[PDB]
Each structure stands twice: as C-alpha cells, then as structure tokens.
Symmetry: D2
Subunit: 237 residues, 4 copies
C-alpha cells in the first residue's frame, strides 16, 4: 500500500473507526485513525484556511484551520517524519464524499519544502502557489473525480452541472513534481502548506472531508476509499 | 520542431553561423543565431554565475554572467515572450561539446516564475532551487549525456572516469514540472533563473557552451545538436 | 533637496507642468515632470494594484497599474538608477490632494530588494509585506497626514470622520529600515514593489494621486508639495 | 529590564550559574539560565551555522547548530512566546568575552517573520538576509563593541588590529526595523533565523558565546553583561 502522512479536515464523525464524536482536524500517520485530533467546527459555506507546518528539528507536525470569523482549531503531533516518509514524495490534496456529501472546493494551495545544509543558508527548495487553478493545470496530477476549471478553483470531488456535490466521490490533486522531503545530509528539512477551501453542503450532515497529504511518488487513490477513507487509505485500520 | 528561448553562454565562436568572433553571451529566440550578443571572457576553471531575468512589463530579457573577480558580461533583448513561448513550458539547462570540449558542470540552479493577477499580490508561482544535486534527482528530467551525482553537481555533458570532458557530447536537464510561463489574465508574468557553472577545459579552445532554455513541455534534444547548436536547435538557421 | 525616483499614479492632469491631458502613470526621475507616461484610466472606488519592477541588468524601470476588470496601464523607462540614487535609500508611498481630492488608501504594500553578488545565488535582501496595516505600525515612518489603523489600511492623505477625503493634504509612509538599493560588487541589484490602493472621489475630478518612491534616507515631505507635486517635490522643475 | 528570548551558543560552561559542564546550545527565556540545553562541540576555527525556528501553532522553539563535518546539536523548548515577548520586538545577534575570549564573527544572518491571517495566504512579513555586511551597514544597529567591515563580516566582539580577539567585550547587532512578532488577529506567526559564525580562539578555553535574540524594541546592552551574560542579561538570575 501507499505510505500516507496527512492532515485531515474531517467533517463527518465515523466513531466506529475511532473518529471523535465531532467534526475534527487530525494528523494521520499511515492510518485514517488519526494519531491526534482536535475538535473542529466546520463552517458550512464559508472559506476556510488550513496551514500545516513541519520541520525536522522540532519534529512536530502542526496544523491550524481557521475561518474569517476567527474560529480556529489546531492539532500538533510529535513525530519524526524521516522514519515514515520515503525520501521522495508527492504532495497533494484529497477529498471524499460517501452517503453524505459536500463540496470540496480548493481555492488556493501553496507548498514549500526546504532542505538546508551545513554550508550557509544554501538550500534546496521547492515552492509552488496556486491562488487560481486553470482548466488544463499541467503542473497538477488530478486523480479520481478531481477537476480544475475556469472559475479558478479545484473541485476535489464531483460536482453536478447544477452546482451540487455528489456522494461516493473521491478525488485528489498532486503537484506534478516529486518533492525531496528529506535528505540525510541536510541539517533542516521543513515543509509548509496552506490551502483555502470552501466546504458547502445541504445534506443532513456534510461529509467527508479534505486532506493535505504526502505520499509515495506513485500514489494513487486506493480502490474504495470514498467516504470515511478520504481517498487516502484502502481501509480503516 | 521545438520552440526555444535561451540565454547561451557560448564559449566557441562559429563565425560561419553568425557568432561574433569571440566567446559571448547571447539571447536566442527560436534560433541559434542570437538576436543579441555581448563579448564574454570565459575564465577557464572558475565558477561563474549566470542570472537571467524577464518580465512581461518591461518585455526585456536580460542576462549577466559573472565570475568572482568581478568580470561580467551583460546582454538584454527587447522581446515580448508572450508571442513566442507557449503558455506552458519546461525550463532547463543545456550544454554541448563538439571537436573542442569543456566540462559543463552546473553547481546550482534556481528558477522562479510568477503570474501576478488583476487583484492584490496574489499569484501563481513556482520556485525551485538546487544548490546541491542528488544522485537520483527525481525532479529533474535528464536528457542526452546529462548526469547528476555524489559530488552534488550536474554534469551536462559527458565527463570520463579520469575527470576529462568528452567531445561530441550533448546533455540537458529540465525541471520535472511544466511551468505556466504566461497567462493572459496576469498583469505581470516574470521569471528569473540563476545557475552557477564551472567550465574547464585543457583544449586548445573550450567548446561549445551552456544555455538556460525554455521550451515546449515535450522538448527533447534535437538530433545532431551537439557542438555549435548547444543541444537546443536542429540546425543553424 | 531630496533625491527622488518615483512611479506616480497621477489622477489629475496639470498640463502646465508637463502632464499629459489625461490621468496617467509616469516614471519620475528627480522631477515631477515624468520622463515617461502612459494614459491611465483611474476607476473611481475600485481597488487597483500597482507593480513596479527594476533591475540593474536591463536597467529599465517598469510599472503597471491594473484593476480587477483587467484594464491596465504600463510605462517603462530606461535608466541606470546607479547614477541617480544614493547607495542607501528609504522606500515609501506618497500621496496628495489639492483643490480636488480623493482618498489615497493603501490596502497593501510589498517591497523586495536584492543584491546578488560575484558568487552563487548569495545575496543581501530585504523583503517586507503589509497586507494589513496596524494602528501603531512601528516599522513604518508616517509623515504629513498619513495615518494607519483599525481598518487594516494606510490612508496617505487626510480623510475626515465622515469618511470624506480632504483637500490640500499630503502624506507619506516610508519603511523604517534603510534599504541598500545598490552596491558596486553586486552583479544584480533589483527591486520590486507592489501596492494595492483604493482611490475614490466624489469630486468633479479626482486629485492628485499616489506614488511609490525611493529617496535619500532622510527624505521628508517638501514644504508646499501638496497638490500636483505629490508630496515628492519642492517645485515643478 | 529588557525582555529577552534567545538561543545561545555558549562556548564556556559557567556551572556555578547553571550551565551544564560542557559547551552547549541553549534556549533562554528571560534568563541566562537556559530552560533547555544540549551538549555542543564548538569547532574552533570552523564556520558553523545556526538555524532557529518557531511558530505559534507548534509553540516550540527549536535551534540546531552544525558544522561542515556534519556534527550538529539541537535543542527545542515548548513555550508560548505570545506570553513572553512584547508585540513589537527587535531581533539581533549578541556575543561576549570575559576572562577568556574568542572571535565572535558572523558571516551571514537571515531572518524571516510572518503573520498569517484568516484570509488566504495573505500575510505580513519581514525577511532580511545579509550574506555580506558592509562597513556602514545602515540597516543594522550596532551596540557595544560590534563592528562591520570590509571583509564582509560582523564582528560582535572586539578584535585587535593583529586579528586577535579581546576579553571583556560585548557587542550586538540588531536589525534596524522593529518586527511585529505577534499580532492577535493572526492565525500563524512564525519566525526563523539562520546565522553563520566563526568562533576561533587560542585561549586556554574559548569564551563566551554568541546568541540570536529577540528583545524589546529599545533593548540595549545591560551594563556589565560581558562574560557569562552574553550581552543579554544584567545578571545571572
Ligand atoms: Ca470521518
Ligand atoms: Ca558557438
Ligand atoms: Ca498631476
Ligand atoms: Ca556560559
Ligand atoms: Mn477523522
Ligand atoms: Mn553564439
Ligand atoms: Mn504627472
Ligand atoms: Mn549557557
């Protein structure tokens, strides 16, 4: 299976697989069952922003999700990602729907990775920012139901012609270039990512969520990873 | 054939195809016959740095090549790259040798493209920098004789076991992700690239040189582009 | 007196001091009489963005001003700023009104200067960006009528309690730190600045305008520089 | 007294004031007696690099110091700097000698602070980099014995005309602009800093060390803060 590290914005509590009994943000290390979660009030129809931060010195993966009214949730988990991730990864955004649904619209996404050595501040780095997506966004690998287009947004999951989200959808967008997430020579390796999103639903309950993830470079959507599995995992173990 | 915009660091004067009769830096738009050249004193075995700068406002492609002793050559050419490049490109480095030879060693390479739009300092951007290359550099597409590895450098053209550069060599390195080099909405599209290089030769004359290039995404080394064509062009037209 | 290089967003034509007979963007080198102008359609009450770009290689100072509907005005002037600016400068924003008036509201301002030297992509650099201004903005030197605060904006010229802009107003905001704008060793000295602005008027004609400027470090608003002199010049020479 | 947060590279063990019995890196929150230390092998005459990283999400101040042979020490301490630092600070480098001495040469220094909000990735930021210092470095406030000059370095403590360091020296360099280190509206505030240094001594033991610090904007060298106090504190409490 793929190796996955992810920060989930999980809009649907699947308490039977260890989600807490509320919408939450979580840090997922090789399992959909988050190593750490925090309560998260998803604001239906509002534009959220998620920031994710790690470096190899503090070894603490942190995420904060906030909305324009000021409400924010934060989660941090102490982990040495050198022991989990492969040296080369792809980075991406993933989302799903199941029996319940929501728009999983990404309005912008930025990522920076840096490997800093012992010379000065000489550095390998990758930084990309999309504040608008294009129709034929050649620097993104879209998987599953994900599309970009003319409104300048990335729809991770399927949205019908009348605008409304669909159930049992899964899709992802990975930056096209592999990322050198660690390198043994480097003194510091850090990454950060930010994405803005608009989760809207008129369902009885929104589901399932959006994740920033880092995977093996050849990562593909696990079969059947709609719903609770966020397009990240083949199962809920 | 391919579409090419390039800044060449041309170490060998091929005066029969329009080179001036001295080593030179030149701006190449869709031909090896540079639209503009400046005399360049290549300092054998010294680490040089090249800076290439363009934006869509001034519409002037500029390059400087310099050495630590302060010697510099500059060339600028007024051109609207919107009418030459496709919207999506790959960026890269190329070098060659022919009857005369040189190492075409790249020590570092950075590139930044930005599209800045109708509104605030919001932006799509790509920035990479390599101050050390890896042995298996997964975010670089190596073509022809280009290799990376263990000394942290990129060797664009063939170098034998005994450290000596080979003749009739041609190699390139392209960044893995396509680059959105222009977009009609953008008020400013800019790019800049820096590379450091070490050209060293024990030949009677060093050849052929090194270029930073921007090409169609599917650009491949043209057949017969060793020597004076710098791995960029199928012919000298 | 002071030394000034400026890009003016000139909302009021003072044809008796060399303005064209339309609102315009212009590049000012040591005089209010712009060396170069382009016609500019100021869209009353709309948020505009200005980008100013210079480097020591192309020696071309360029500016574009644009609005979200896509309308743009560009001006570029070939000038070697090494022979005009002192080595150390302060950078800032200026605006004024006179008999006619307008708000001169700055919503954001960013600036980057870099000196890139004889060797690798090593560098002195300064980058700041304000996307929200604070009430007591300690890294800004406010002069004349300039104020910040609580709406996250910078008001360059006086605005009364009832939200209305005042006449005969002049104000500026300079970044607190001096900027090393050129250095003889540097192979590339570049700067770029972006600001977003909201010029709104209920006057018969809006005036005077907004400029990004670079000055001697000790620059102060010249006496009598309201109105057509944009808070930059002591006279119209 | 001033409020000080610092990362000390402490070359001299003053075990009577709580230093461990070896050279160490430490995190100092309002006291020279580090909240956390790690053993550090200072490499006499070698160029070290120090990286310091904090963000308001993880609330973990981390530092790593390394040298070209690969040896590195790291220290991290969990602290919410919002509860310690004033909103506006200056940032600086500090060093001292006492009865023993060393060169406290800084070869480069970079700093970035960012306040990120809940809009997109809109941000206030300050970033500066010095990879070479100038004689009259107008964007640095030198205090005590600190000087810059023509060799491109910052000597924090006194060095005699023959090149040799002096005892009982203290000096600091602060970036000229105040830094907005936190702001209640921001979702993330982060800072990072890197400096490279060359500590050389021919004494019986080198002393005393170099610190990156963040202080009240009006911070000055406490009287008598040579030696063990690193120019940071009026006393060893
Ligand atoms: Ca769930
Ligand atoms: Ca040639
Ligand atoms: Ca005017
Ligand atoms: Ca000590
Ligand atoms: Mn969950
Ligand atoms: Mn040529
Ligand atoms: Mn004018
Ligand atoms: Mn100590």
């Amino acid at each position: 299976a793929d190796t996955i590290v992810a920060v989930e914005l999980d809009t649907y509590p699947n308490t039977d697989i260890g989600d807490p009994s509320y919408p939450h943000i979580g840090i997922d290390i090789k399992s959909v069952r988050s190593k750490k979660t925090a309560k998260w009030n998803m604001q239906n129809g509002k534009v959220g922003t998620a920031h994710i931060i790690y470096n190899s010195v503090g070894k603490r993966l942190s995420a904060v999700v906030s909305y324009p009214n000021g409400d924010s949730a934060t989660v941090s988990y102490d982990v040495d990602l050198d022991n989990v991730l492969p040296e080369w990864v792809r980075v991406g955004l993933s989302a799903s729907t199941g029996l319940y649904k929501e728009t999983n619209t990404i309005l912008s996404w930025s990522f920076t990775s840096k490997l800093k050595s012992n010379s000065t501040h000489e550095t390998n780095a990758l930084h990309f920012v999309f504040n608008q997506f294009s129709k034929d966004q050649k620097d993104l690998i879209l998987q599953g139901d994900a599309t970009t287009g003319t409104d300048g947004n990335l729809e991770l999951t399927r949205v019908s012609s009348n605008g409304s989200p669909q159930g049992s959808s899964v899709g992802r967008a990975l930056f096209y270039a592999p990322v050198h997430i660690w390198e043994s020579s480097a003194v510091v390796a850090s990454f950060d990512a930010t994405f803005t999103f608009l989760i809207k639903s008129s369902d009885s309950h929104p589901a399932d969520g959006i994740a920033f993830f880092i995977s093996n470079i050849d990562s593909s959507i696990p079969s059947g990873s709609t719903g609770r599995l966020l397009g990240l995992f083949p199962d809920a173990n």
